[PDB]
Amino acid sequence: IVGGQDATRGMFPYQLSLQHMGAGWYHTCGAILLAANKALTAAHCTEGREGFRVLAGAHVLPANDQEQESDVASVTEHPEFDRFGPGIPNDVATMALATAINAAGNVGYATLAAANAPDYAGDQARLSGWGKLHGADDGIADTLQYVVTTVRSTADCNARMPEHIQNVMDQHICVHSDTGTTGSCQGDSGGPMTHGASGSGNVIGVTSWGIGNPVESCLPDFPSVYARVSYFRAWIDAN
């Protein structure tokens, strides 16, 4: 997260760290805890890869402070996920957890936007995750970050985009500050967009993509694009 701050423990009880197996674990994406054995993330976090675990109730990743964790038994990416198509369509995926994650301590299940939800244009919302704090940074954040921002309409999103990347769709939900100082970054993908500025809010988006340049992989000067949960609610529940 760019332009944000440390979260407080238990602020986002459904926030997961999705970790991929290489030379040791490494945080590759955020995820969203939906139930005891079910999680939600971005499809581009899992397509073509295997060997995952999720950390629940974590705060400082280097501290190994997760309250619970589970191996990922299987992943179901959206059948129409097009990783390299304009706008990265249908960038959602569910995950079956080998170990049950209980609603206890700083861990809880997200409430998702309903299928008939409004577009939330102009509403406040929060982005969370362990993504990089700046586009030029080498590594991700150690402590869970969050930032308050503003949901924008489809046309507003594309107007704020580079003229050659006006690929925001109604199946997306984007956020952007008029100061151009806040947004998501690599490592935040797959995490939740939480409705509202404070307190409990529905998860209304899944971190998908953003804009970079030759020196910064993420830029708050342009919107951060999420997969709209209300658009994918029926599919997520069914898969």
Author numbering: 1 to 239
Article sentences:
Prior to crystallization, the protein samples were treated with the serine protease inhibitor phenylmethylsulphonylfluoride (PMSF). This treatment facilitated the clear observation of electron densities corresponding to the PMSF molecule covalently bonded to Ser189 of snFPITE-n1, snFPITE-n2-A, and snFPITE-n2-B within the PMSF-snFPITE-n1/n2 cocrystal structures. Based on protein sequence alignment, the closest homolog of snFPITE-n1 was found to be the fibrinolytic enzyme from Enchytraeus japonensis (44% identity). High-resolution crystal structures of both snFPITE-n1 and snFPITE-n2 reconfirmed that their catalytic triads consisted of His44, Asp91, and Ser189, and the weak substrate specificity might be caused by Gly183 and Ile88 residues in the binding pockets S1 and S2, or the four additional residues (Cys, Leu, Pro, and Asp) inserted into the S1 pocket of snFPITEs. Notably, both Asp91 and Ser189 established hydrogen bonds with His44, a feature that is essential for facilitating the catalytic interaction. Furthermore, the model of snFPITE-n1 complexed with a canonical human plasminogen peptide displayed that a steric clash between the peptide and snFPITE-n1 was absent, suggesting that this peptide could be an appropriate substrate for snFPITE-n1. This peptide was bound to snFPITE-n1 with the Arg580 residue inserted into the negatively charged pocket, as in tPA. Meanwhile, six snFPITE-n1 models with six 7-mer peptide substrates from α, β, and γ chains of fibrinogen revealed the absence of steric clash between snFPITE-n1 and these peptide substrates, suggesting that snFPITE-n1 could accommodate substrates from the fibrinogen chains. In all these models, the Lys or Arg residue was buried in the negatively charged pocket. Meanwhile, the pockets of snFPITE-n1, which were less charged than those of tPA and plasmin, were compatible with the broader substrate selectivity of this enzyme.
Here, we introduce a small facultative plasminogen-independent thrombolytic enzyme, snFPITE, isolated from Sipunculus nudus. Compared to traditional thrombolytic agents, snFPITE does not require plasminogen for thrombolysis, although its presence enhances lytic activity. Native/SDS-PAGE, high-resolution mass spectrometry (HRMS), and ultrahigh-performance liquid chromatography (UHPLC) unveiled that snFPITE was a small monomer protein with a molecular weight of 24.925 kD. Mechanistically, snFPITE activates plasminogen and degrades fibrin(ogen) in a multisite cleavage manner. snFPITE is inhibited by plasminogen activator inhibitor 1 and α2-antiplasmin via a competitive inhibition.
